[PDB]
């Protein structure tokens, strides 16, 4: 009696590798926050009047 792995084996199937799409996490990103846009002005009427 001999084991099943003692004889050479050939794959009769046509392998098809399937790599699922990895999960992705999106982080917040802004070129200019609303605070930066407000600060872009040279003068602010609110602060000047205050």
């Amino acid at each position: 009696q001999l084991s099943r792995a003692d004889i050479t084996t050939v794959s009769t199937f046509i392998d098809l590798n399937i790599t699922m799409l990895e999960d992705h996490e999106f982080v917040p990103l802004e070129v200019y926050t609303r605070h930066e846009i407000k600060d872009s002005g040279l003068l602010d009427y609110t602060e000047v009047q205050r």
Binding site: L42, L43, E47, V48
Partner: protein, 50 residues
């Protein structure tokens, strides 16, 4: 300061109050002038010098 009370007469009273304050100056490109926290414009480059 105001003048003392003298009947049916106009009087002029001068008041001089020296004031010194620390203000945050701001400037934008080409940086040829800058403003102050009080809203006053200064037509001189912040980097002007000899």
């Amino acid at each position: 300061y105001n003048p003392s009370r003298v009947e049916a007469f106009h009087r002029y009273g001068t008041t001089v109050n020296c004031i010194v304050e620390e203000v945050d100056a701001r400037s934008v490109y080409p940086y040829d002038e800058f403003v102050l926290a009080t809203g006053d414009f200064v037509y001189m480059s912040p980097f002007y010098g000899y």
